[PDB]
Amino acid sequence: DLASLAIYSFWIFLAGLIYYLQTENMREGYPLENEDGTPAANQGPFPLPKPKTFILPHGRGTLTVPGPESEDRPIALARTAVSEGFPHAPTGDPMKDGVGPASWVARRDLPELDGHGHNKIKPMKAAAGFHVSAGKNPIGLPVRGCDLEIAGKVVDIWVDIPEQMARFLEVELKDGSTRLLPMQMVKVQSNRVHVNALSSDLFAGIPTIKSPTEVTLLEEDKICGYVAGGLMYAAPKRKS
Amino acid sequence: ALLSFERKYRVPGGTLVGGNLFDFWVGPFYVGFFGVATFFFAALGIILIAWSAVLQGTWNPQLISVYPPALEYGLGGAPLAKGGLWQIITICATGAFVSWALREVEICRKLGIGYHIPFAFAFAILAYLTLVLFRPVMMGAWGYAFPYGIWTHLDWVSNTGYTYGNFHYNPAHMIAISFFFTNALALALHGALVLSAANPEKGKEMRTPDHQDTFFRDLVGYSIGTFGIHRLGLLLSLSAVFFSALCMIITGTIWFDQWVDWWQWWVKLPWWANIPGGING
Amino acid sequence: NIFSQVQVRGPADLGMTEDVNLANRSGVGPFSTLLGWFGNAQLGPIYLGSLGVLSLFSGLMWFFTIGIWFWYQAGWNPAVFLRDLFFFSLEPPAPEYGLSFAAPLKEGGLWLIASFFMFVAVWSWWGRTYLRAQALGMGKHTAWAFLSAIWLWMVLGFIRPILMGSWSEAVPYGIFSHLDWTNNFSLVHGNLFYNPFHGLSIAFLYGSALLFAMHGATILAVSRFGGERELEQIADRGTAAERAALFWRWTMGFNATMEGIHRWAIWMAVLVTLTGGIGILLSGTVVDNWYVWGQNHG
Ligand code: BCL
Numbered sequence A: 001d002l003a004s005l006a007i008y009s010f011w012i013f014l015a016g017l018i019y020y021l022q023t024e025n026m027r028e029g030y031p032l033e034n035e036d037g038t039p040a041a042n043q044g045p046f047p048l049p050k051p052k053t054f055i056l057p058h059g060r061g062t063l064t065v066p067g068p069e070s071e072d073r074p075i076a077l078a079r080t081a082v083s084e085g086f087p088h089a090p091t092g093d094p095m096k097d098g099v100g101p102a103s104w105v106a107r108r109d110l111p112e113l114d115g116h117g118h119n120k121i122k123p124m125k126a127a128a129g130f131h132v133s134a135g136k137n138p139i140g141l142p143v144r145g146c147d148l149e150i151a152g153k154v155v156d157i158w159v160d161i162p163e164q165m166a167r168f169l170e171v172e173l174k175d176g177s178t179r180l181l182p183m184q185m186v187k188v189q190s191n192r193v194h195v196n197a198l199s200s201d202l203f204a205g206i207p208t209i210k211s212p213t214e215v216t217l218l219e220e221d222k223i224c225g226y227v228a229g230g231l232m233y234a235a236p237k238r239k240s
Numbered sequence B: 001a002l003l004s005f006e007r008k009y010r011v012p013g014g015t016l017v018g019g020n021l022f023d024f025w026v027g028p029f030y031v032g033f034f035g036v037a038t039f040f041f042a043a044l045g046i047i048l049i050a051w052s053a054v055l056q057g058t059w060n061p062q063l064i065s066v067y068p069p070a071l072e073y074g075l076g077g078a079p080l081a082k083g084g085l086w087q088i089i090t091i092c093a094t095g096a097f098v099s100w101a102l103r104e105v106e107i108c109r110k111l112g113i114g115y116h117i118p119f120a121f122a123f124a125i126l127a128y129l130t131l132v133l134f135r136p137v138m139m140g141a142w143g144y145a146f147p148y149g150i151w152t153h154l155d156w157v158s159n160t161g162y163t164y165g166n167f168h169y170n171p172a173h174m175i176a177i178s179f180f181f182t183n184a185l186a187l188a189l190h191g192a193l194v195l196s197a198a199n200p201e202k203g204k205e206m207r208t209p210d211h212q213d214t215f216f217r218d219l220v221g222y223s224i225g226t227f228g229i230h231r232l233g234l235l236l237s238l239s240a241v242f243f244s245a246l247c248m249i250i251t252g253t254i255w256f257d258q259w260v261d262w263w264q265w266w267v268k269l270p271w272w273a274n275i276p277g278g279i280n281g
Numbered sequence C: 001n002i003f004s005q006v007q008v009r010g011p012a013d014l015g016m017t018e019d020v021n022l023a024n025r026s027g028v029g030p031f032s033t034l035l036g037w038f039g040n041a042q043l044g045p046i047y048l049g050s051l052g053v054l055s056l057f058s059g060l061m062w063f064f065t066i067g068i069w070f071w072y073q074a075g076w077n078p079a080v081f082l083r084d085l086f087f088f089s090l091e092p093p094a095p096e097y098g099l100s101f102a103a104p105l106k107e108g109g110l111w112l113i114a115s116f117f118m119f120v121a122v123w124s125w126w127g128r129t130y131l132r133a134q135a136l137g138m139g140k141h142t143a144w145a146f147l148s149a150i151w152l153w154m155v156l157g158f159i160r161p162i163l164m165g166s167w168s169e170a171v172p173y174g175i176f177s178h179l180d181w182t183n184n185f186s187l188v189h190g191n192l193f194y195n196p197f198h199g200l201s202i203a204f205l206y207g208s209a210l211l212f213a214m215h216g217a218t219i220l221a222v223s224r225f226g227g228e229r230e231l232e233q234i235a236d237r238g239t240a241a242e243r244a245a246l247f248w249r250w251t252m253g254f255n256a257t258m259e260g261i262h263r264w265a266i267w268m269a270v271l272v273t274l275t276g277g278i279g280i281l282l283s284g285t286v287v288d289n290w291y292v293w294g295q296n297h298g
């Protein structure tokens, strides 16, 4: 009957749909590889989808996926076993090298632009008409690392103009240079800003930005990467 | 075996239990100590379930059903064929679930991300525990739990419901449903919003988040934004399930009568209780 | 974390100006600091336009046409009105009138008026979702997603009442009354738990919660690497997208991309009322009792 028809029909629809859904999520990081980077033998039942090309605003070109994949940065890792499936140990300083939970991707070295073609993110000093409207203004508060030692002082807030949001705290270190600190990895308190991931001694290692009034996708990744990695690698310095 | 960008992430560490012992992968999958735990609990449980199936004398999945002990057994142990098997199976499920959560924690650490996912999952686990542990205890027999079978479980739902009248009147049930509906609404929108920006009209440039915020203010005069909608989603979801637990944990424990009748409180407020006319006067 | 720990404000954002008729957009509203915690603090502006007004006017007419009926039931007494608010009900015409538009007002006519108002209200608002997108050059996802919802509503109070031969088969406007109608609709058709569309529909509802839980917690888990900035992540994969995909690959064996995850999303939610609509449509037109149907499959 009709009902039987409809339901049998639907289970068929649903199956080609999953198939669709699945092949679309195969647009990045495919095809699969062996730990040595050579193409892996068994890529699953699903074919790579036919490529699609994105037209990036503000004449920043195009992006076609799937496409040629490459890390475009050295990886300082060495195998710890003779068969597949085991960890790869950092061969240096994982933090300094950017592997592990400290990994960063070679994103473009251009900043994210808003709908108008202006830099999406800005130090608040250069963002005409922005102010802390609620909560504790961090600016001026010392910054404490997981080792409970003071590392610097907030000397500005880098805001996201189109979404009117605090993205990073800029921090002034003992030598007078500054670093950005992701907003999402710090606790703003009444008399201090506490950073659990990094011990005071690692703040200097936080990668620097080439221009003082801009951050690029590459530098966001290298920073967030680094600060995140502290959680696992600063661990010996963290007390509480 | 690895995604084109996976290797630099596959470093040692992050394990909660047992150091480097189980710190490794099997194909795409991460094992970890709890990798093993869940496997063991999952193996055992499925076994017991098959064992129930022979005692039942059917291999047909639409028929197979593992029932809790009958009320006469209260919160004591029961013979295998008479409810023990369900009790173990329930222990094993719990073991599986919790372990699966703790593995999520272990992966979280290795990758250096937040614990929001293990977190949210614990709500699912807590809803399940409400229906097979917290409620039966409080009620006083494993027998109030739902049976493990594809349709028999739908039956428990239907019977348990109709016991208190039309269950629609359970007030926390009303609230819990509003989230389920609301969440789906919001998942519908979020998905649609991002896709429409990433896949504009033919030959046009990828839109921007600014267009996303604009599209919605134009539509309903407000936009929660990108960080917002993700906060929103997590919340509606967790809330739906939170109220779902609540509506059950109260049902049969502190309220055992017809749910519709509980509304008489409102209608019988002394200031309008006796005023004639309307529906109730 | 979940709530903002510092709020920053700037000049009210009047938004992108594509092909949008700026003459129709309103003025910026206030800013809720309250709101500012969960998400955006800025209210407005909003786009009015012809369809917005028609929609918005029919919308109120519907609501009010029901409202006066409730008052008439309450004996115009504000006390009763409050006491009995969820008990009042605007019911469709009796089965006697069939698909007739001649039912007396106290006997079903008022229901038709209200519905007519809702019909126009909803469709115009649909066209509104479409146009608002067109004017910014965006995909029409939202309008199509919306159409799914519309499907179930169309079926409940219009398509099914018409295929059954009478408006009496439609849903009454009322809080407790539309609950009862639902509960009763299942009883009559032999328990909707045997309607496999109903069962499918529940799977996608449950799933929507499962997914929006998964997606939300994930994006929050990696917002420490600017995860929420999904459009740029699509355009240039960040570590965020990577950690996201991998956490999931390592847990359950496969994974999404940032554009990908949102396709899972729109389809999981859209299938709820899509399947739903179908389950209800066959209910009572082709299948009288899902249990009997369940025994044979035919
Ligand atoms: C929480 C609310 C009620 C209840 C009310 C209903 C109602 C009402 C319905 C279901 C439906 C289903 N229920 Mg139930 N269900 C409950 C508790 C459970 C439990 C549990 C351990 O707590 C589980 C595992 C299930 C599982 C299921 C599926 C068989 C089915 C589709 C659900 C779905 O899409 O979810 C979304 C999740 C996903 C898409 C992720 C993938 C889920 C897959 C499908 C899981 C299948 C597991 C199953 C085959 C058993 C495996 C166990 C062993 C390892 C073999 N229910 C409680 C008692 N359930 C629907 C149905 O059609 O089944 C008859 C239906 O109509």
Ligand code: BCL
Pocket: B157, B181, B184, C118, C122, C149, C150, C152, C153, C156, C181, C182, C183, C184, C185, C186, C191, C192, C193, C195, C197, C198, C201, C202, C205, C272, C273, C275, C276, C277, C279, C280
């Ligand atoms: C006793 C009750 C019966 C039963 C009878 C029914 C009936 C009858 C129906 C459902 C339906 C549904 N049931 Mg059932 N159901 C039962 C038990 C259950 C259980 C359970 C036991 O755990 C669950 C989980 C469900 C779950 C569900 C949903 C999956 C499904 C509706 C999805 C939806 O989101 O629509 C919500 C979305 C809409 C209604 C879309 C409307 C969109 C419109 C356009 C909104 C306009 C707004 C308006 C103009 C006002 C404006 C707003 C103001 C400005 C604020 N049922 C039992 C067996 N169920 C529906 C279905 O699809 O079944 C197959 C349905 O018709």
Ligand SMILES: CC[C@H]1c2cc3[nH]c4c(c3C)C(=O)[C@H](C(=O)OC)c4c3nc(cc4[nH]c(cc(n2)[C@@H]1C)c(C(C)=O)c4C)[C@@H](C)[C@@H]3CCC(=O)OC/C=C(\C)CCC[C@@H](C)CCC[C@H](C)CCCC(C)C
Pocket: B181, B182, B184, B185, B188, B189, B192, B219, B220, C055, C056, C058, C059, C060, C063, C121, C122, C125, C126, C129, C142, C143, C145, C146, C147, C148, C149, C269, C270, C271, C272, C273
């Ligand atoms: C795919 C399935 C899900 C879905 C999707 C969906 N719904 C949608 C969309 C989509 C994709 C839209 O684009 C569209 C939308 O614009 O949302 C922002 C819509 C929408 N879904 C809505 C509601 C809705 N969707 C629902 C369900 C669902 N929608 C599904 C679960 C439900 C239910 C019953 O679960 C409801 C109630 C609307 C918010 C919106 C469609 C708006 C519309 O058509 O308006 C027409 C008429 C008016 C303008 C009426 C206004 C009259 C009011 C002023 C009266 C009430 C006054 C009241 C006392 C006010 C106070 C409220 C307080 C909280 C402050």
Ligand SMILES: CC[C@H]1c2cc3[nH]c4c(c3C)C(=O)[C@H](C(=O)OC)c4c3nc(cc4[nH]c(cc(n2)[C@@H]1C)c(C(C)=O)c4C)[C@@H](C)[C@@H]3CCC(=O)OC/C=C(\C)CCC[C@H](C)CCC[C@H](C)CCCC(C)C
Pocket: B038, B041, B042, B045, B046, B089, B092, B093, B096, B097, B100, B104, B117, B118, B120, B121, B123, B124, B147, B148, B149, B150, B151, B153, B237, B238, B241, C206, C207, C209, C210, C211, C213, C214, C217, C251, C252
């Ligand atoms: C809290 C909000 C919602 C939510 C969230 C949620 N679910 C989650 C997560 C999150 C955040 C995960 O991270 C985790 C996941 O990895 O998803 C891919 C998970 C998950 N949610 C799942 C299912 C699921 N979630 C559901 C619900 C929900 N999940 C909510 C609505 C439902 C239902 C019925 O609504 C189901 C069916 C899994 C796909 C996955 C967890 C997988 C897992 O725990 O693996 C460990 C266990 C096994 C491999 C099998 C164990 C076998 C048992 C020992 C025996 C079988 C016993 C069982 C009781 C029989 C039941 C029979 C039925 C017919 C009744």
Ligand SMILES: COC(C)(C)C(=O)C/C=C(\C)CC/C=C(\C)CC/C=C(\C)CCCC/C(C)=C/CC[C@H](C)CC/C=C(\C)CCC=C(C)C
Pocket: C063, C064, C066, C067, C068, C070, C071, C112, C115, C116, C118, C119, C153, C154, C155, C156, C157, C158, C171, C172, C173, C174, C175, C178
């Ligand atoms: C404060 O008092 C005043 C008077 C000021 C008020 O305004 C108060 C007002 C309230 C008390 C209002 C309360 C309103 C509610 C309780 C409403 C509840 C509504 C629901 C629960 C609705 C549920 C389901 C509705 C459904 C499925 C409607 C479907 C409608 C349609 C598909 C429309 C079909 C079209 C029809 C039959 C006519 C078509 C005619 C043509 C010519 C095309």
Ligand SMILES: CCCCCCCCCCCC[N+](C)(C)[O-]
Pocket: B075, B076, B077, B087, B088, B090, B091, B094, B133
């Ligand atoms: C996480 C534990 C879940 C267990 C589910 C039910 C187990 C019942 C345990 C009772 C065993 C014996 N008793 C009555 C003497 O306590």
Ligand SMILES: CCCCCCCCCCCC[N+](C)(C)[O-]
Pocket: A018, C196, C197, C199, C200, C203, C207, C267, C268
């Ligand atoms: C978006 C893809 C995920 C879809 C989930 C498919 C599994 C649902 C199984 C429901 C069982 C249903 N049925 C028809 C017997 O009632």
Ligand SMILES: CCCCCCCCCCCC[N+](C)(C)[O-]
Pocket: B026, B027, B028, C252, C253, C254
């Ligand atoms: C519904 C769950 C689907 C998970 C898919 C997992 C893909 C695994 C690919 C094969 C890897 C094989 N193995 C375990 C033999 O090494």
Ligand SMILES: CCCCCCCCCCCC[N+](C)(C)[O-]
Pocket: A018, A022, A043, A044, A045, A046, C253, C254, C255
């Ligand atoms: C109801 C949800 C079911 C999810 C559908 C299962 C998809 C499995 C995809 C496995 C992909 C294998 N691969 C390529 C990663 O090895």
Ligand SMILES: [Fe+3]
Pocket: B190, B194, B230, C215, C219, C230, C262
């Ligand atoms: Fe998202």
